[PDB]
């Protein structure tokens, strides 16, 4: 289809978690999405915020519609579950590596499904729990499902990184590496 | 020993507004798990069973008017609608690109930070553009309306000589130079 | 701050 | 196609009721507005389908289910004669026409 | 709002609306009973005919113009205009205050 601009509404339910999620992107990058907990419209830039609104409703609404036709598919199709399809996984840091100067690592999940994933950051071998942050579960063309996750360093010639990544499609737990 | 994989069945949706020439073209999507079964393209100006799983569901869809005559509203009601008001910030969002070379025997123009995803990279060896077997990477979406793109050069060097990465974008004015 | 619009999906025929 | 049931009612302050609407049109769409003399037709509440409903004009004081795709009902916990109006009842496929039911009109008295 | 014409005339009859919209409707409502839809006109057009009736639109004014052409007794009923709002949900009808019409004999 020829296009200067595609601007797609996306949306997913599931029975594990997340049950739900409903977003918009323009030109593959989320703009906005429902959280269908706090029942908010939450926006990717606050640019967005201040010049668009969006009622809420247009997502839970739309939520509920299919989650009424997955109950009516899971009927119909007998019951078929889908085959896990494993994750894709490569690092990358934001800006160039410079050591002393503040980046961040970029961790990109493709290729995916079902949208159930547990993706966590390791430094030096152990957790690391504050100055991360992720995005949606993002669709593709091939209704298969990738993700991003990010964590805020400081690039350090003794430090090495890695995205332990778990999956359904995937019998052991996947690391991978990187360092500078 | 564990591993067995949770029941879980999933549905998604699709509602694509497709920009070309003052013209909106809007696809519905219906997919079970990772199977598409039913859409609805407004070029073709009712449903389409994709699949065996869809035939129902679009004949029943196709039978009633009133559904019809409000999916071929679409086009003017959501695309038309959602294009004139976001031009500003979506259609017209320029982000200057940040450019570094540094070698690792290939040298890596890096270009981070920039938005839109066109961009041109040319390599020059003394004033001459000098292709010389470039690789250069895909695009690279950092997930927050940003890009990356790394170009890689076979380079052999001799003292005296000065490597320059020229970057162009719609962005810039002038190209951006930086010479190793 | 002006609005989008947005479409309902439609329930499948059952 | 659209049915209200009850059609006449009348309650004590207080008391409690359910007025059910039915379709046999198998419309996604259903609407429950009140009609009072001065105001004109103003809606409650509304419902794009089985689980969900949404307030409307005047949602204050009634409650809404749509357990089935072919019924959504209103529901009034204390009734107060504030509430008495007539109750329309209405269907549709989307933005286009909606098919109103016969209506119900609802006295409460002390 | 209230108007009577003589049986056989033309009766026409005014509304307007406050917000953006898609579409506008025009809804009759005889004996206090079911109120019944009419005519639908959308943003991009200015006249629609339907039976004896014709509705005229003015997104510049946000007003429209019911015109009912070689009346009968069977029209006489209140006339109420719906719209919806650009932004909100597509199926969420507003209703106007209605124009009570009286066709005489």
């Known amino acids: 289809i020829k296009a200067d601009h595609v601007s797609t509404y996306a949306a997913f339910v599931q029975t594990h978690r997340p049950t739900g999620e409903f977003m918009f992107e323009f030109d593959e990058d989320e703009m906005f999405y429902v959280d269908l907990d706090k029942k908010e419209t939450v926006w990717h830039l606050e640019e967005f915020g201040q010049a668009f609104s969006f009622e809420a409703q247009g997502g839970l609404a739309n939520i509920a519609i299919l989650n009424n036709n997955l109950n009516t598919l899971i009927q119909r199709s007998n019951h078929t579950q889908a085959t896990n399809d494993p994750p894709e996984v490569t690092v990358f840091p934001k800006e160039p590596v410079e050591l002393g100067q503040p980046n961040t690592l970029i961790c990109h999940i493709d290729k995916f499904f079902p949208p159930v994933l547990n993706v966590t950051w390791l430094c030096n071998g152990e957790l690391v729990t504050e100055g991360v942050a992720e995005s949606l579960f993002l669709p593709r063309t091939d209704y298969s499902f990738h993700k991003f996750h990010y964590l805020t360093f400081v690039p350090s010639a003794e430090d090495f990184y890695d995205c332990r990544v778990e999956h359904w499609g995937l019998d052991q737990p996947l690391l991978k590496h990187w360092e500078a | 020993a564990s591993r067995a994989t949770p029941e879980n069945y999933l549905f998604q949706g699709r509602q694509e507004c497709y920009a070309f020439n003052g013209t909106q073209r809007f696809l519905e999507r219906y997919i079970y798990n990772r199977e598409e079964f039913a859409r609805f393209d407004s070029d073709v100006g009712e449903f389409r069973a994709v699949t065996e799983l869809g035939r129902p569901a679009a004949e029943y869809w196709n039978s009633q008017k009133d559904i019809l005559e409000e999916k071929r509203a679409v086009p003017d009601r959501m695309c038309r609608h959602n294009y004139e008001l976001g031009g500003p910030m979506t259609l017209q969002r320029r982000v200057q690109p940040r450019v570094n070379v540094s070698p690792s025997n290939l040298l890596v123009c890096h270009v981070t930070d920039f938005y839109p995803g066109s961009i041109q990279v040319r390599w020059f060896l003394n004033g001459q553009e000098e292709t010389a077997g470039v690789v250069s990477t895909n695009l690279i979406r950092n997930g927050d309306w940003t890009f990356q793109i790394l170009v890689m050069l076979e380079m052999t060097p001799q003292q005296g000589d000065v490597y320059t990465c020229q970057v162009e974008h719609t962005s810039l004015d002038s190209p951006v130079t930086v010479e190793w | 701050a002006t609005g989008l619009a947005w479409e309902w999906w439609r329930t499948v025929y059952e | 196609g659209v049915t209200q049931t009850p059609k006449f009612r009348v309650l004590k302050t207080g008391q409690s009721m359910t007025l059910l609407c039915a379709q046999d049109?198998?419309?996604?769409?259903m609407y429950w507005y009140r009609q009072d003399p001065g105001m004109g037709l103003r809606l409650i509440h509304y419902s794009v389908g089985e689980g969900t409903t949404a307030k409307g004009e005047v949602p204050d004081g009634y409650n809404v289910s749509r357990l089935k795709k072919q019924n959504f009902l209103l529901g009034l916990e204390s009734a107060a004669p504030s509430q008495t109006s007539v109750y329309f009842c209405?269907?549709?496929?989307?933005?286009?026409?909606?098919?109103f039911g016969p209506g119900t009109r609802l006295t409460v008295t002390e | 709002q209230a108007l009577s014409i003589q049986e056989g005339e033309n009766a026409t009859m005014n509304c307007s609306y406050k917000?953006?919209?898609?579409?506008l409707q025009w809804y009759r409502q005889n004996s206090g009973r079911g109120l019944v839809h009419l005519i639908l006109?959308?943003?991009?057009?200015r006249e629609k005919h339907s039976g004896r009736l014709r509705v005229t639109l003015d997104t510049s004014k946000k007003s429209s113009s019911l015109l009912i052409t070689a009346s009968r007794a069977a029209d006489t009923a209140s006339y109420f205009c719906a719209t919806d709002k650009k932004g909100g949900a597509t199926n969420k009808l507003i209703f106007g205050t209605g124009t009570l019409l009286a066709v005489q004999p």
């Open positions: 049109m198998n419309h996604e769409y």
């Open positions: 209405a269907s549709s496929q989307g933005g286009g026409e909606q098919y």
């Open positions: 006109i959308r943003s991009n057009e």
């Open positions: 917000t953006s919209i898609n579409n």
